[model samples]
Target chain A: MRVLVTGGAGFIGSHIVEDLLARGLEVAVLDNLATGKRENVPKGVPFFRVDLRDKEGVERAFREFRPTHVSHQAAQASVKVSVEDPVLDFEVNLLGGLNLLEACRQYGVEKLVFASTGGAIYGEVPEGERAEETWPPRPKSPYAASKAAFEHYLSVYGQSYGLKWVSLRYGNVYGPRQDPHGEAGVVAIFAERVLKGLPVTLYARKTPGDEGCVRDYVYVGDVAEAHALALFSLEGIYNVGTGEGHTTREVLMAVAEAAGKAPEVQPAPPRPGDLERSVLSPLKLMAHGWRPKVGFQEGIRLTVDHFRGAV
Target chain B: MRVLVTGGAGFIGSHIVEDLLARGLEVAVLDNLATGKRENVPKGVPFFRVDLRDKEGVERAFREFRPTHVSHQAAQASVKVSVEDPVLDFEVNLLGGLNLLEACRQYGVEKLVFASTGGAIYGEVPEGERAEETWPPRPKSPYAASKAAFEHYLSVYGQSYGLKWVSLRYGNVYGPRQDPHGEAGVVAIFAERVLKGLPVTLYARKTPGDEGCVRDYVYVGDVAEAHALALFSLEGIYNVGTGEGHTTREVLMAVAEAAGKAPEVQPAPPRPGDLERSVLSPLKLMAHGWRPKVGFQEGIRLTVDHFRGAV
Candidate 1:
């Protein structure tokens, strides 16, 4: 398959590109280098520096690549930024997403695997309950809303235009190459700081000093595997997660252990627009013989090891 | 309350404008006059001939109107048009919707009532079942996707920005002043054709000569009443429809009876992107002291009378 991967130079997208390349599929990378690094793209891959919001640029990419399948992972992903400037979020995520979908339809691209969000789509998974794909989306932030909205567009495109699609609702995906300075990716932030003997701040779920929001943290490699599976075989929504909820304190503790340093902890109040808990049920994807191979401790170790070399 | 009614010159919006005006509330019109007629808007009400896509124009309207509340009913309201140009649909419905939301937030509008769709949001209803508000949205067309996506934005804005909002998911709204030349509003289409003694095309559900898609036809006046209620007191999502489904053939027969003409009928194949059935259950709205006061026969009669003069 000649696959075109949007945001292929970014964290999760880069891994997905590597996975697809290893599977012996012809692949190309399309990214505007907004947050993505050009160095992440391998030497042999055809890279097109195109922003999704530019209609002609996206069309040019599609026209030249003539992809059989599309892996759409590019997005304005920060929840904080989305809440602050919803128009930017809408323009980039929804409008730009429509541009890609249109390109796919016009070019007769067979299938598209979308990188949706399980992390925030289901507002707050009740204690002890895992959010299934069937649960109606309750997006509390503009970031989640954009993801949920794009999924609807995907469905409509699938039904009306005969575009085969699958939405991988990934949980809090973390691993090596995760930007340590971003608003999200607590594991990456903690790993880099703890390894450098710097204090780590833990934003509480409710009050200060409490365990922060619970999240299903899946390793980026596992998420990439899920994306590959979704591209090759899946046709609808599936959560790419480990089906396990972990709090901020748990993540900090894991990172501290992996770095072999017990750093100072600063307590902070709950972050605005942060969900109390979000856990996904991976049983649907698992039913198709897929699994998250890396556990929490091992994943933390892998992330810390990567940071150790970089820092 | 001082109110700004977007698309206040259009079919459903004009009805809502009249409703709010009659209730002794201050009202103004914000419409581009694309499909909405200038005459449809009353003489005294302040009118802003601005497209929702024009950010500066929308902001100027908000700056001058200083509305305490907003009734957002403007949209690119056509399934066929949306399919033909999903980008236009996204820009007008979603991007434009966001512009309105931003204006509301920036101007500190107390409450905003959004006109969402029940007719197309839920993909299809079974033979004996009606779609509930709780059912997950299954948008088959880009028009429905736009509506569905806008609802998510409403929810997000309400959660994060403290914008009080209510989304009224309207079913096939039909009545006096309904645009007969539009892609939708089957009742108005039939009424005008029947009154002119012109043949009517009845698109089938499965085959030619079969009863076409089932829809919950609610009168425009009743929809206006629901809008008033939503703006005044309600919060969150509510379906504005009768719990009754009627076929296209039923609509044609009613129009013929009302017009006192037996026009020739032409059988046609099912239209692309047409749902076989879409009936909504208004139990939630009924619990709040609202009801579909106009029955099928009476509402069609009203529409026919309106078209009788126009034709």
Candidate 2:
């Protein structure tokens, strides 16, 4: 099947693009390069350096590519940035997403795989309990709220028009091309800082078992596999995660060990509007023959190896 | 409180604007007059003929009005239009809402009373069941989805920036100013047709008891009063309904009786995306010392009287 991957030059999106190409599916990429790099898109694939907010740009790309499917991964990805300037965030995430959905409908795209959020959408999951697909979203920040809002719009479009869709509510995804400077991508941040001998600040009081904030850290490669599986399956919303939790401190230590560095921890006050804990139950997606293959240790090692090469 | 009422020249918005003025509160109006009438703005009230999608215009209105609170009533208010062109729907509802929100944040608007929807937000209801404010939304149309999405954004802004808000999920509001030519505003449609000696179409299969789609028909005046109450209350989400259900047949008969005409019904197939049943429970908002004062029959009388004069 032919596919259009929005934000295909970004971290998780780039991985999804590569995977689709490996599967011998025709692929194209659309990215504005706000946070995405042009080089991250593979050489042979058609690339549209277009903003999702640009109605004409998005439509023009769709008209040219005429992909049967869309992997919608473009978004304003920072919770902190959203908190600071939610209007800008809304323009990019909410408005931009609607623009793409409209394009898919107009172009007669059969199906779309949306990159939703599990960690941010389900705020403050209690210890030992993971958020299931059935859990009502409690968004703590504008970023999470925008993602949740887009999911609702997707559902509406799916119902109003017969446009098939699968929204994969993803966990904390970290891998090779993940941006280390962004407020999100904690694993990538840790990997980059540790590999380069920069000080890593864990933004919460360190506890024994659970460090700062707890989250379900799923590898980006596994997330891409879930997207592929979702493309083949019927319409449904599913959480893509390892069905496990890792504290920020635990993740930091893992990254440190992976990068062969000693963790010298700096404690900072918890960020406002930060969820204390969040994890996702991937049981729904697993039923559709999708699972997280790379464990946290292995994923961190892989990510650190990539950063090491870059440094 | 100095308040800015967006869409203040439209149906329910005009009522709220009048009520606010009657209460001796300072009021300003901002409307593009898309469906709204210019004369609806009371004499001497400041009016800005500004579209919500115009970012600069919205910010300028906020700066000029210097509102302490906002009654957000502006929207692209047609469900069929939304289904036909969801991109336009999203642009108007979602993008327009963000524009107002940004203006609110920039100018330190203390509180906002948002006019949301209950009937459309909750996709359907059982025979005797009514949708409560706490129930999760299942929007079947782009219009409904857009309203639900904005409520989430309001929540995030409240958490992140301390912008206190109250989202009143209104039932099917109908009264004098409701546009008769619109696909919605069933009461106005029926009244206008019957008064003008024209045929009335009920877009649903004729069943034995109800004969048509069910909705919680709340009077526009009561909805306006609810907005007034919400402005002073603390942040919340409430259903501004009468906790009663009325079938389209029942509503038609009431309008006919109010108009002093025999009910002439033209049967048609239900609209493809229409819901079978929808009712809202007003128990949450009732605690705020507000209730639907005008009964359906009384509301029909007032509405028919207005159309009678118009004809």
Candidate 3:
């Protein structure tokens, strides 16, 4: 199958491209490189330096690549940034998403796999419960809102245009190639900072000096696998998570253990628009013979190792 | 309180404008007059002929009016049209909505009342079920998706920006001043056509020549009252419906009785993106001392009377 992967030069998208290529499928990369790197795209792969908001650029890519399937992994991907400028977030996420869908419809693309957010889409998962796919979305930030809104559009397009689609709600995905300097990806940030002996700020769940908000962290490789499965077999929404919640402090501790360096910790208040707890139930995907191969410790160790070699 | 009403010259918005003016509040109209008429807006009211997609024009209206509250009633309000061109629906309903929200945030507008859809938001009510505010949204068309997506933005804006907001999910609102020449408002179309002794084509619910899809038809006057209550008091989503379902055949029969003419009925296949059944429960709004003041027969009679004079 010929696949067009949007944001293919970014953290999650690059891994998806590799996975699709390894599966012997033809793949093309489309990214604006806003937060993605050009070098992340492997040589010999068809690359289109196009922003999703540019309707003609997206149309041009679809016209040339002639993809049978689409993997939509592009997004604004930051809650803090969305809260600061919601219009920009809407423009990139929802507006750009509609453009891609229109292109998919026009090009007669058979299927599309969307990378939705499990971490923020389910506003706040209660302490003892994991968010299932059936749980109604309660978006607290504009970034989360955009993700939820796009899912609605996907469902509509699927019904009205007869396009097959799947929404993979990812939970705090982290691994090699993740940008440590961004507002998200705590695992990558802690791994890099701990290796450099820099103090990591631990934002609290409720107050300063407390264990930070709980999140379901999944490895990028596992997410890439889910993308492949969704493109081929899935039909509806599925959470690509381990169903495990980890506090920010736990992430830092794991990073320090992997880096063999105990960095100083600076206590900080909770970040605005940050959820107190979020965990996803992967039972649906597991029922389909898919499981997260990487555990939390193993995934964090691999991230730390990648940082050590790269830094 | 000073309030700015978007689409204030349109059917539902004109009724809302009259209601607000009668209540002794300062009001302004901001409409592009795409489907709305300039004459529909009162002479004394401050009017700004602006499209919501024009960000600069929206900002200009906000700067001039400096409204404390906003009643967002504008939209690309057709399911069939949305299925035909989803991009235009997204651009007008969602992108334009974000522009308005941004203007509200910039000007520190206190509260905003959104005109969300109850009929389309719930994809299809079962044979004997009425959709409630607590029910998760299931958008079947791009028109519904835009409405549902705008609600998500409102929730996020309310939480992050501290802008108190209310989303009144309206049913199939019909009454005097309703446009008869649009893809929507079947009641208005039937009334205008039947009054002029013209034939009406009834799109089927499932097969040709059957009682068409059932809907909870609420009058525009009741909807305007709900809008005022939402602007002044409510803070979250509320369904504005009658909790009564009526078939298209029933609506035509009512119009025929009111107009004293039985027009020829031409049966047609169901329109694309048309739901078979959609009814809403207005219990949440009823708890706040609001009820639909116009009955089905009375509302249809009033609509026919208006069409008789206009046509």
* Model 3 chain B poorest 10 in a row by lDDT: B175-184
User: What local distance difference test score does each model get?
Assistant: 0.89, 0.86, 0.91
User: What TM-score would candidate 2 get against the native?
Assistant: 0.96
Off by over 4 Å in 1: A181-184
Q: How many residue pairs collide in each prediction?
A: 0, 0, 0
List per-model TM-scores for chain B: 0.98, 0.96, 0.98
**lDDT of each residue in A65-144, candidate 2, tens digit only:** 99999999998888888888887888898888888988998889999999888888888888789899888878879899
> Which residue pairs in candidate 1 collide?
none
lDDT of 2 by residue, B189-210 (tens): 9998887778888877344333
Order the candidates by lDDT, highest first — what do you get? 3, 1, 2
Superposition error at A210 for model 2 (Å): 7.8
Which residue window of length 10 is worst by lDDT in model 1 chain A? A180-189
Per-residue error at A146 for model 1, in Å?
Answer: 0.3
Tens-digit per-residue lDDT, B84-193, candidate 3: 88988998999999999999999999999999989999888998899988899999999999999999998999999998899999899999888876544999899988
Candidate 2, superposed: residue stretches over 4 Å from native: A181-184, A205-210, B205-210
Worst 10 residues of 2 chain B by lDDT: B202-211
Q: Candidate 3 residues A137-175, lDDT tens each?
A: 999999989999999999999999998999999988899
Ranking by DockQ: 3, 1, 2
